[PDB]
Amino acid sequence: QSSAEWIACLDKRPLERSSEDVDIIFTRLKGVKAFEKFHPNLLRQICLCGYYENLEKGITLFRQGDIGTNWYAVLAGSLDVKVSETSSHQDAVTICTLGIGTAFGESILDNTPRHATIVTRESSELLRIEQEDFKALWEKYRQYMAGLLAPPYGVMETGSNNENVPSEKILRAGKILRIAILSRAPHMIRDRKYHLKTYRQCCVGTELVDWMIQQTSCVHSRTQAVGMWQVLLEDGVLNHVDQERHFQDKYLFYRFLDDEREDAPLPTEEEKKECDEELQDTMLLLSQMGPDAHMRMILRKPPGQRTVDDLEIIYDELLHIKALSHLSTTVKRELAGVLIFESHAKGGTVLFNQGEEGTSWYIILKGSVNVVIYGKGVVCTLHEGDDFGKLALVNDAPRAASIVLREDNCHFLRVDKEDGNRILRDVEANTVRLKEHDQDVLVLEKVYTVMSGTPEKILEHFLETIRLEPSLNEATDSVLNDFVMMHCVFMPNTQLCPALVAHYHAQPSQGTEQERMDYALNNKRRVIRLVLQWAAMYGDLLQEDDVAMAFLEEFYVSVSDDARMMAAFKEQLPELEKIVKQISEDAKAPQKKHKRAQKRQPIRGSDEVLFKVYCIDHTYTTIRVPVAASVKEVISAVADKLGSGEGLIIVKMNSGGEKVVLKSNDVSVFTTLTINGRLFACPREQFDSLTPLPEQEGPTTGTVGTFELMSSKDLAYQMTTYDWELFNCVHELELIYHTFGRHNFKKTTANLDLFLRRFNEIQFWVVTEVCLCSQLSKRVQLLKKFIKIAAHCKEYKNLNSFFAIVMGLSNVAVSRLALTWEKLPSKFKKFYAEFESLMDPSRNHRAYRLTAAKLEPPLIPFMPLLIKDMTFTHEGNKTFIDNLVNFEKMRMIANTARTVRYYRSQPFNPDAAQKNHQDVRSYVRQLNVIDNQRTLSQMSHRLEPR
C-alpha cells in the first residue's frame, strides 16, 4: 500500500469516517510536537474532524485583521508570520517562521481578529480544524492544551515557575554500556595512577573510543565515537574526573555515574543478558543523538578559534537543520564559522524587547518561546526548529516583537548582523556575474564554476574554457562532463547540434585579419574537442538519435573540406563516422526474447522485441515491435494481426488483478511492468471481464529444497555477477532521462528499468520462500540462510542485493512471524539487527552513505536510494530561474550519475574459485516469485494467526 495513505483518509469527508481511517491517521499524527502532551482521546477527536491542506509556496492562509476560521498544525513545510504596525499590509514584516510540528490559529477561540498575516514559505502540509470543532475540543480538553496554546487560551510559561541533568534513556544507555564493558573488557574500568594521585574505577577517553569502534558496525571513525560519548557527558551520565564540559579522544579519565559510589555492585547475570539484548539498539540510539551533541560541544568554541575539523563537524549537522535548508552550500560553510550557540536556564527570560536594536537571527535548537507584540499580546508560540528575529539581518530597523522563553533550558543558534552581512558580501566577492542587457547572463564562484545562464550562453563558456593542451586533456574532459551529460535537459540535440554548426563557422569577433586567421582555428579545434566529448558520452546511443548522426555526418564533412587540417584531432571523428556507418548498417535488432542463461547485453530502444500481448480469453498474439514502441504503435500491431475492430485498449495488469489502461503516447512499456505484470489488449467494452493469468498468481510450492544444497557464498556470488551484468547495461544517461521523465526525451530506460525491477525481484524472492515454508523449523533455517546470503553479498560489495534481502526480511509478512524470529540463534539476531541499522534513513541515510564511501570499486550501490537522491534533487530545485537554466542543479544531479561511473570503473573478479556449476547460476537468474503482497500477508497469518 501507499506509504502515505493517511492523507487519503483526511480527504474522506468527516461524516464518512471509518475506525481504520482514524487508526491510520492517528498513527501518523501521534508524531507531532504539538500533539505530544495530548491525551489519546483528544488526538482521536482531532483525527475525526481534521482536514488536510497541501499548500504551495507563497500562499496566504489569512491576513492580519481578518476573521479567523480555523486552527492549524503543520505536518510539513514552513510559514512566515508577518505583522504590520500600520493599516497597510505592505508595511508588514516577517517576525518569525513556523515549521513542522508547530501549531497556530487559536485566537479563533474568542473570535479575535488575526494578529498576523501568515504565508507558506514553501510547499506545506497542514492539519486544519474548523473553529466550531476546535472550540469544542478546547472546552472538553482545555487542561491538556494549556501548555500548547498561547495565552489567554493556554498558560504563558511551562517552565519551573509552577530535575537534574540526567534523562531516562541516556541514564539507561550509560547503564547498558557500562555493563557491556565490565562483561566484555573488564580492564577498561579500574583504578588508575597519574602523578601520585590515583583515580578510582575510571576509564580512558581514547580507550572508550577504541572499544565503541570494536563493538559495533554503525561507528566509522574516532570522531563519530567522540560525538556519541559526548551524548553521555553533556547529560552527566559519564563524567570527566575534573569536570570538563566536553569529551575528548585523549588520555583523560572519565567515570560512569554508577561507579561514583565506592561499593558499586557487579552486574547480575540478568543485567548482562538484558544488556546483551540492548547494546545494539543503544549504539544505534547514540549514533543518532551523537552528531548534534558534537555540534553543540564544538560550537562552544568562539567563532575565531575553530579548526578545519571543528567547522566540518558543525557544517555536517547544519545540513540537517530545516531553517538553513534554503541557504547555499557556501553560505552554510561560511556559517559554521560565525554561528553562536546560546542556552538559557529559566523560562520567562526575555531574550529581546520590541523596539530594541535588532542584533541577531535565532534558530531554536531546544525549547520554545513566546512572540509578544505590544498591544496584541502573545501573537504566536515557537518551538524547536523554528526561527525568529531575522529582520535584524535585513536592515537597521528595531525589533517589531519581543521574545520570552516559554520553558526552561532553551538552546538556540544565533547569527549576528555583522557576520551575516560579511558572509553576504564575501559571497559576492567570490561571485562573477557577466551581464548582457543589464541583467545576469552567467554567474560563477572562484575555483570557474557555472551557476546559471541560457543554453547558448552556457555553451560558449564551455567551448571558450576548453584547454587544447594534451596535458590538461583529462582536466578538460572533466569540466565538459557536466555539460555533455546534462545538456539534454536544457538544450536537446535539436538545438545543440545547429548551435555547434554555427560556432564552428562563426567568424572571430576580434583581431586583425591575420590574428583572426588563428582565432577561427582555435575556435574550430575547441568545437571539435567538445563534439568528441559529446560523442563519447552518448556513445552507442548516437545510433538512436537521427539528428545526432546526421550532424556528425555533415560535421565530418566540414572538418575534412579544410585545406589545412587538425592533424592530431581529425582521425578520431572519422572513426565515429565509420562505426556509425558500420554497426548502424545491419538488419538485426537483435530480436530480443522475454517471457539459456544469457550474459546481459544493453537493451536499446531501436532493438525489436518479440512480446506477448494477451486477450480476455487468455490467448495471446506475439508482436514484433521496437522496444521503444509507443502504445499506439503496439495497438496497431495487435489490431492488425487479430484484425481486431475499432476500440482496442492496452491494459497493464499486475498479479493483484489491478488494471491500468495505457495512454497512446506512452513509450517503452515492456520494461515498466511489475515482476508478474502482464499486458492485455481487449475492447473497452469488456474491460471488466479482463482477468489476470494463472501464471501471474506466482509459484505455489517453495524451492527451499533446491537452493539449500547451495552455499550462501555461491548464491551470493552468482547473484552478484548477474547484478553486475544488469548494472553495467545501464547507460549513465538513462539515469538522467528517468530523473527528468522518460516520456519527454522519447528515449528508453529499459536497462535501468530491468535493474530496479531486479531489486524488487530479490526482496519478493525472500518473502515468497519464507511464506511458502509451512514447517516452523525450516523457516528458521531460511532466516539463517538469507542472512548469510546477505552477509556474503555485502562482503562482495554488492550493496544492491544486500539491501534487497534485508528489505525482504523486513517485510511485514516476514517481520510479524514472532514465533519464527524468536527461535533464531542470537548470533543471527545480531547480524540482522546490524543490517537493519544500515537502512536507518536518519540524516538522509547517513548510515548507508558512510558504509559505501568507505569502499572502493568495483561496487554495486543501493540503487533505489540512489534514484531517490536524483528525484529529490530534481523536485527540490528548479531547472530554470528567471528564464535561466539553473546549472548548479544540473551539476548536483550529475554528481549522482558520476558516482555510478566511479562505482563501476573497476572490473569485478574476486578469487578465481566461484568453476561453480551452472546450476546455481540457473536458479539465481531464473527466480519465480510472488509479488502480490495481499497474498504474502494472508499466508503469514495462516502460519502464525493473530
Swiss-Prot record:
Keywords tagged on the record: cAMP, cAMP-binding, Cytoplasm, Exocytosis, Guanine-nucleotide releasing factor, Membrane, Nucleotide-binding, Repeat
Superkingdom, taxonomy of origin: Eukaryota
Binding site for 3',5'-cyclic AMP: G389, K390, L391, A392, R399, A400
Protein name: Rap guanine nucleotide exchange factor 4
Domain annotation N-terminal Ras-GEF: ranges: 448-584
GO biological process: adenylate cyclase-activating G protein-coupled receptor signaling pathway; adenylate cyclase-modulating G protein-coupled receptor signaling pathway; calcium-ion regulated exocytosis; hormone secretion; insulin secretion; positive regulation of insulin secretion; regulation of exocytosis; regulation of synaptic vesicle cycle
SUPFAM superfamilies listed in its UniProt record: cAMP-binding domain-like, Ras GEF, Ubiquitin-like, Winged helix' DNA-binding domain
Membrane topology (UniProt): Peripheral membrane protein
Gene3D superfamilies, per database record: 1.10.8.1240, Jelly Rolls (2.60.120.10), Phosphatidylinositol 3-kinase Catalytic Subunit, Chain A, domain 1 (3.10.20.90), Ras guanine-nucleotide exchange factors catalytic domain (1.10.840.10), Son of sevenless (SoS) protein Chain: S domain 1 (1.20.870.10), Winged helix-like DNA-binding domain superfamily/Winged helix DNA-binding domain (1.10.10.10)
This protein's record includes keyword Cytoplasm: yes
GO cellular component, one term: cytosol
